[PDB]
Symmetry: C7
Subunit: 30 residues, 7 copies
């Protein structure tokens, strides 16, 4: 369904956010 697909799109964007936050943690280390 279109609604399920859009919700999966939201999840994908949030996994993208998480990746970026992990990069921030690494940047602060260095």
């Amino acid at each position: 369904g279109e609604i399920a697909k859009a919700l999966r799109e939201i999840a994908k964007a949030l996994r993208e956010c998480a990746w970026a936050h992990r990069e921030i943690a690494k940047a602060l280390r260095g």
Copy 2:
């Protein structure tokens, strides 16, 4: 549908958020 379209706009905004967090990581590295 209007609900699906709005959910897709939520995902798009979160992709913007992810892009900015990646820029934050870059600013911290540099």
Copy 3:
């Protein structure tokens, strides 16, 4: 519909968040 409108409000608020995160990146570089 009221549900669709509310979901669009959520998306707009997240677009505000993204703008603010971009400002944080700009502040860190500057």
Copy 4:
């Protein structure tokens, strides 16, 4: 409806988050 009202509460909370992120940007500038 209760669902629409709850979704608007989510948007309002996210607008609060954006406000705080804007404050973080200003704090970093100074």
Copy 5:
């Protein structure tokens, strides 16, 4: 309804996030 109640929990959690982001701004100023 259970769905509305859960959405309200989501909004409340985001209000917690906003409070914490405000504390982050305050810590940066101080």
Copy 6:
């Protein structure tokens, strides 16, 4: 219901995020 339970898991995850942001505010203080 499965949908309500999933929404409550989203809320719980966001409360975890808030806890982490509170730790960030503390870390900046120290």
Copy 7:
């Protein structure tokens, strides 16, 4: 259901976000 499954993906992505924010707090402390 597909909608419930997608909402659970959203929750899991937020749990990834929370882990990363904790790592950010740890990096700032150290």
